[PDB]
Design a protein around this ligand. Sequence first.
Ligand SMILES: Nc1ncnc2c1ncn2[C@@H]1O[C@H](COP(=O)(O)OP(=O)(O)OP(=O)(O)O)[C@@H](O)[C@H]1O
Ligand SMILES: Nc1ncnc2c1ncn2[C@@H]1O[C@H](COP(=O)(O)OP(=O)(O)OP(=O)(O)O)[C@@H](O)[C@H]1O
Ligand SMILES: Nc1ncnc2c1ncn2[C@@H]1O[C@H](COP(=O)(O)OP(=O)(O)O)[C@@H](O)[C@H]1O
Ligand SMILES: [Mg+2]
Ligand SMILES: [Mg+2]
Lengths: 233, 384, 889, 394
Amino acid sequence: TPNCRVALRNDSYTLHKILPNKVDPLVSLMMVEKVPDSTYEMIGGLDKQIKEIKEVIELPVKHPELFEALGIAQPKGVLLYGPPGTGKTLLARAVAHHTDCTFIRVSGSELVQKFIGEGARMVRELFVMAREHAPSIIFMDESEVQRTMLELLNQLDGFEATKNIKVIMATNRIDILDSALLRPGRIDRKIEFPPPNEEARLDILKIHSRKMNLTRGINLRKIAELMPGASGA
Amino acid sequence: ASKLPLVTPHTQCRLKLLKLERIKDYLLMEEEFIRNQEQMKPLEEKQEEERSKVDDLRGTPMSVGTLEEIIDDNHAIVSTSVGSEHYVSILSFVDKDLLEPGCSVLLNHKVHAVIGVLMDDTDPLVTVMKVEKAPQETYADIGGLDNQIQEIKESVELPLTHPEYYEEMGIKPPKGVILYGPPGTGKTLLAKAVANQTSATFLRVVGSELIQKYLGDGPKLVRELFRVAEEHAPSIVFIDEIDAIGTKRYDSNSGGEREIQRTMLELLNQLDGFDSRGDVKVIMATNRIETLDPALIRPGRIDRKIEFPLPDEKTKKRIFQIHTSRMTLADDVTLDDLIMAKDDLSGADIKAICTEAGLMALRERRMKVTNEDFKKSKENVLYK
Amino acid sequence: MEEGGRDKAPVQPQQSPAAAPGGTDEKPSGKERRDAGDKDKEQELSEEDKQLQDELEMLVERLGEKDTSLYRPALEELRRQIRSSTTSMTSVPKPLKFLRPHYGKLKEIYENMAPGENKRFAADIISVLAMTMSGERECLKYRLVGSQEELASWGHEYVRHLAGEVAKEWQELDDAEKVQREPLLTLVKEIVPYNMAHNAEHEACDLLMEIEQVDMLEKDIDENAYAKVCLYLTSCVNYVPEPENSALLRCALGVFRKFSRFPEALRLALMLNDMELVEDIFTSCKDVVVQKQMAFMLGRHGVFLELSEDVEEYEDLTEIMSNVQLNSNFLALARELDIMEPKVPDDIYKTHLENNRFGGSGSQVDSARMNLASSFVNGFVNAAFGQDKLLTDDGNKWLYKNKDHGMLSAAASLGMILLWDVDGGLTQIDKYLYSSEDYIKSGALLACGIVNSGVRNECDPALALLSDYVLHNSNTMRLGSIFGLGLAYAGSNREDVLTLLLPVMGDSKSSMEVAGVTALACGMIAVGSCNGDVTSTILQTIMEKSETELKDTYARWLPLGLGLNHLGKGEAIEAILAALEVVSEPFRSFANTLVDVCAYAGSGNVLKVQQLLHICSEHFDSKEKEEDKDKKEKKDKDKKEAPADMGAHQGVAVLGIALIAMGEEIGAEMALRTFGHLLRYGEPTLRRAVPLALALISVSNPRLNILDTLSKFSHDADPEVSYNSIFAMGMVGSGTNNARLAAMLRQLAQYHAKDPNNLFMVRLAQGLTHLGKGTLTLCPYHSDRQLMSQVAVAGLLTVLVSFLDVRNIILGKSHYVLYGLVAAMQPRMLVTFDEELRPLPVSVRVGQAVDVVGQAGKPKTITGFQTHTTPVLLAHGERAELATEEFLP
Amino acid sequence: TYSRQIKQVEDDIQQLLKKINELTGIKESDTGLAPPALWDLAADKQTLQSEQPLQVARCTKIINADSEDPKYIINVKQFAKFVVDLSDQVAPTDIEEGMRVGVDRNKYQIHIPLPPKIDPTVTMMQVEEKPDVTYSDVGGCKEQIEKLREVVETPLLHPERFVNLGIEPPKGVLLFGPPGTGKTLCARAVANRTDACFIRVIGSELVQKYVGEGARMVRELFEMARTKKACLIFFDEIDAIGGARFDDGAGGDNEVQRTMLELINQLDGFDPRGNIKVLMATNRPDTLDPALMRPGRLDRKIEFSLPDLEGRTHIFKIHARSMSVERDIRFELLARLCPNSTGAEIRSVCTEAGMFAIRARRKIATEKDFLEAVNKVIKSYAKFSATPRYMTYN
Ligand SMILES: Nc1ncnc2c1ncn2[C@@H]1O[C@H](COP(=O)(O)OP(=O)(O)OP(=O)(O)O)[C@@H](O)[C@H]1O
Ligand SMILES: Nc1ncnc2c1ncn2[C@@H]1O[C@H](COP(=O)(O)OP(=O)(O)OP(=O)(O)O)[C@@H](O)[C@H]1O
Ligand SMILES: Nc1ncnc2c1ncn2[C@@H]1O[C@H](COP(=O)(O)OP(=O)(O)O)[C@@H](O)[C@H]1O
Ligand SMILES: [Mg+2]
Ligand SMILES: [Mg+2]
């Protein structure tokens, strides 16, 4: 295989034996960042947003034929918004986890940089690893991100032909992001994350208290009413 | 291989019969002459004996080095992989034509003498900027412009497909093309139709990604962009959103506005330098046309200036016909109520309504799109 | 598959010809009226060329083929009406009734009797009826008859007239590009007796059209650019009267029956030179036709225009002789001094500049043979009135310093400086003639023949160089006096001074290098008659070369004048005359190949080219006939300059594979001089393949052999970017590639391309392709470089001033009587049209537009506009009269 | 008639070419090998002659010599420094200090001196090749050409009219005006006609990434230029390489000014450049530095103004001499319709009006085809116009 280790003799430099499988640079990139791997079973009270995020990302992989029956273009970009600490990251991590996607997040760092390329004069060199793990998902945190997303959305607008690549941006305060990103054909669906109410502060406590050693008789309902909607964090 | 380029009778003439029967004689006489070499001087196989003589000359360890100069009497200064460079000699089976300074070579292990050259594994930025396949549907997908669709073929397509019309006029085709208008009227959309049609290599770069973080790295990227464009073919360079080089300031760029300027001076060279340009067409697109430098928009660098208007209310009806072509449209709807909903809705607004109305159908597992889908579509798309 | 239903034709012509044996006997009406129903209905359903799937022509012969074999032969009482219904119906599908052995049995249906007026049912249809079959008649049937039984029965007699109207039928129906199919009809019919078919089709072409001449006209010369010798004999003399009998365009007579001059009969073009002086209307074509008769493809015409009308129409001759030559001096006088040229450019020696800092210091090269090359900072740059006054001080101070052969060389440089001159060229010599030296006067008086080259007026028929010659008891006075007059009178065919210089051959004086260039002098004069020259040459050859086995001074000089004496005829009689003449030992049979292929300059006779290789291919030849096999390859160097690019690609594909790749002595020593003979054009196919074997010097051989390929790879004229290939080799040629024998040579390479900026057309193709020899002045030098010993002593007579037939450069000249017009010109890459749509696009590089005396260039066809109509000569030839007419508003 | 018969006899002989050329050896499409019938010179002899007697001769750099003895101090890339000796084959003359030499791997002794390092980004900016622009294309500005041409080439083509009169002619010249006026075009005509080395520099190539990196490229330019006898340096768009020294507060644009000071030092003072002639060309000269505008560096100050009227009429005759036109059109009417127009616009008028002839059907333009191109180029693209904020050079 290309990019595979070998053994090698030294007197004549003859090939000896295949030495296995070192790492993918995409694997070492996610190993640096260490996203907190999540699932649907640790989601507290976000039932309507899970239905919205599946219609855009989950469905055009398992059933790409289902949009040809409607004859509309399949969506590409998702914007998530709300106050910080309300679960933007864990929802995006879960959706990639439950339909077998390579969850790639870019932050524009420089320890990351040595695995993408030597200089990477663009950001678009990220796609060479991304179209190799073809059903992948690009994720971006909270103005360098807003220029990074415009460069990606112009590539996957018709110029990129390899399908099943989607981008997800998470930020707060949508009234200050760029007007070029607020062109109505640009972002396919925007999803608001409210702070949780009394019914939704309860089950986040319920899921988190699974790994504590509890005493019988607690009445968590009284506890969740003491917090007047801080966040899910 | 390139034995005879003459085909011009193109019939059953004796001349096509005579020419190829002359070439029949030159071939067999060349055959029978070189047949007599191994008959009277066998002396080797020549299929592998001279080959294995070379293969036993060059060692099994083959180190890869790097040229940096050439002295013509078969010895040149080459760089090792460490940094300590040598003054080795060059062989005769080395085909001394593909030797540029910086080209990867093959050295000896013992005396490091120049054995062979190596094909380059290029590049992780050429393949970034080179559009591989044709993007999308044809010019029939656009609809409604019909005046500037003629204009772009006039400057790009017709110079390439019919190189006769300009010669009979004795003229050179117009050089540069810029596309400007309000946002979302189809500037990027028309460039996809050119990339559909053409046979030239098509290069695309956003204007935002011209700006860099190191000093002097910006103008270096422009010099190697037009290097790539010239070294292939007749080609098309598409630069999108070039107002973004000047409007937004980013703190990643170390130099301030007086590094943006030095980048623009290099681009201002590459369009109308004094070097022999070649066959490279340039297409540019923006929506803030009043912001950028008029020294770059002078005739000589950009010749044609194409304005895009907002869609008219009889051309809007054409656009609804296009984006609702292959969808199972229920007969509840009337498209004319949707036309004058916003007085100045772009072409991008129409596709944003048509896709989002289809998404409302899949929430209820339906197959056709009703009227109240579009009623709650424009509430979702427009008004927020 | 929708079969059935409408099957009328697979049923009723399946019934009625099947009932035709049932309705021939005892049914007299159905034998004819159903046959008349079978003749017209098969005729009517076949005429449209849109339904080629006829409903009978591929349907009736499933049984009708077995019917017709019992209908036509087995009836045996065929009448006079029922054969016009049989053979008009049964001879139509027979190219498709029969398979590929049709060719022996077209006549078992047709030659029973040709029914009437066979084109009556071949009117609307182009070639499906019988014009494909008429091609099948002349293909195989007429060829077996007309091989040794041309004068024969019905297979020739009506076949002439059957090929009469059918050849008229191609120019009858549509007048499409099927007009050029008639040269496919006239030539396949009676290939060698082409004139018996052409005389039937010359007079028919005379009444054919006056617009449908010109594309068939170029179609014939497309077939006449190469042919078999008897075909090239026949089709070119049939080519002549079509601009005379049908058309009277009549101005392409002179240059394009130089095509017909040497092969057919040397009197025949002289009978066409008679056709010049008959059509005396009036002056404009009359001036331009005889412009070329002096110094463009031959001379020797100045004795046929002193008739009784010597006023101006026959006083053109002296104006043809030297005055338009003086207008070709007025080229360099007024027009070339205005564009660029100063009196001393001199600075290609200054272009040898930056090696003093390229790697340290300089002031090192102090070779005295460099000063031989330093003669050409003067000598090469000063052509076309580059006259020098005290700028020859590099030639003045080296005249009186050393190098006796350079006293010859600096004095012979002055002939190139005042070139094409009669006015003051003699006067410039005399200020440096008087030195009382064998080497100064003999070099200066040899240059006196250079100055008047092409003048041939009274300068010295027996005056100056005969007085030089009769001084002889010694060195180059004996030698350098016969070279100049044979140069100056090379275009002459005068008998007298050839017999002044015939006892030079018959002296038997043992100065051998004089006798070697003696045959080289007289061979330049005549190419035809005077077999007593051939007697005079071979007698001293038997008297000297037989009683010795020594150097190529015999071999490079003495037989070379014989091939010039019999140049340019593919008759293969001169091979019988000269090769049987010196039947001898094989080193005197070196000249077996000399006079053989010098008669075979440009044609297609590739049966010569196989016997140019297969006799002595390699044979490994341990140092015996390597001069011969180099000379056998030397005669492969012609036959490739003018098949019009057809063998030029086929020669570069062979020699780079054959000789320099996988040969022993022919490739490594000599096989590069083809490229010094194939082209001085300049194209990177061979221009990049030669320094692969040059910059790799291969110093193990006699390394001046590769350095022989150094200077004469710079042999290409028309200066280019090739200074890069030479000065970089001139950089490594300073230390290495030693200056002790090559400092003359690397700059002789360098100063050669830029001789001046202009005056480079020495490449033997005029009009479009005719010869203009040319070859007689050049071929002695390429034979001379075999190999060594003349780079110092003997070849300096040749290596300076060998080729001097530079018929200079341009075609931008008006020559309307006042000389006031400039032009309206437009130069282009060469034309590509053979047969295309009407109007045919000539050429494709329209981006250049000029009006005045500008350059020629390598592949250039130049046309005009402005409705000047350019009505003079229309073909090419660089001195159009340029009349005008404007009847187009 | 012989439809297949010419075809398959064509096809097999086109195959019989390839079927035996595979039996000669051009094949095995390589990864860096030669034509096999070309390397036969080093096939047996120089294979064992250029390899086995000849050695590697690792190349070095010399620090200095010392008195009384050879005893040369040498230096290599990263390894140590030695004390070395010559061979016999070379004299001790051309082993001057600060010189690259080749050195064997065992005894460490000097074989041959080497040419110095050229720093190959300076190597690419030598032009090597000439454009096709003649002074006949620069019509309209004849007096500006003549005042230019007497500085660049007449001391080089005739270095005797100036010496015997006793004057040292000027050395530098800048060319400045509005854009599209003909500045870069007129410089191409100089490189067409000249003969010396013509080293071009675009001012946006000296901005580098490190500190003081750009000032070294200015030296290596003038190092190789002093080696040549005559040379012609061309600077284009030098408003990038330096405007003025204005340093305030945080030191900004400090790095480019050190490159601009090194360029000033190579032009004047202390054993000067000699026979090197420079030629700048800017777009807005008001930004440039007063110490750079000083004569002795930038003596001539050729202005490229807009053409008056007869300048414009001559430009139409250049860009429309080679196009199919109606005979009876007048250009003098056209030049009155373009009052302040550059030469670049007049070319675009001529190239646009030919397209109108290609729009419908026809083969030659008319007078009204020009007038339909005038109001589109001049009066409809007038929103941009590029000139009126550059006449004031701001
Ligand atoms: N006239 C039109 N005809 C057909 N489709 C259109 C038209 N105008 C816009 N669209 C749709 O709008 C989408 C976006 O168009 P496009 O991005 O090319 O406009 P733009 O002006 O280039 O946008 P921007 O100004 O943001 O670059 C396209 O996918 C296209 O489908
Ligand atoms: N006097 C003139 N005659 C003919 N053409 C001209 C003239 N002046 C300018 N041009 C045209 O202008 C173009 C070259 O302009 P040039 O590059 O010299 O502009 P400039 O003066 O250098 O300004 P910039 O630096 O912005 O390019 C050429 O296409 C040329 O045809
Ligand atoms: N709805 C939720 N249910 C469970 N845990 C949550 C929820 N929202 C936030 N968290 C907690 O917040 C952390 C994730 O941070 P997150 O809120 O995703 O960042 P962001 O502010 O980008 O959304 C996790 O440790 C998780 O335990
Ligand atoms: Mg767009
Ligand atoms: Mg410019």
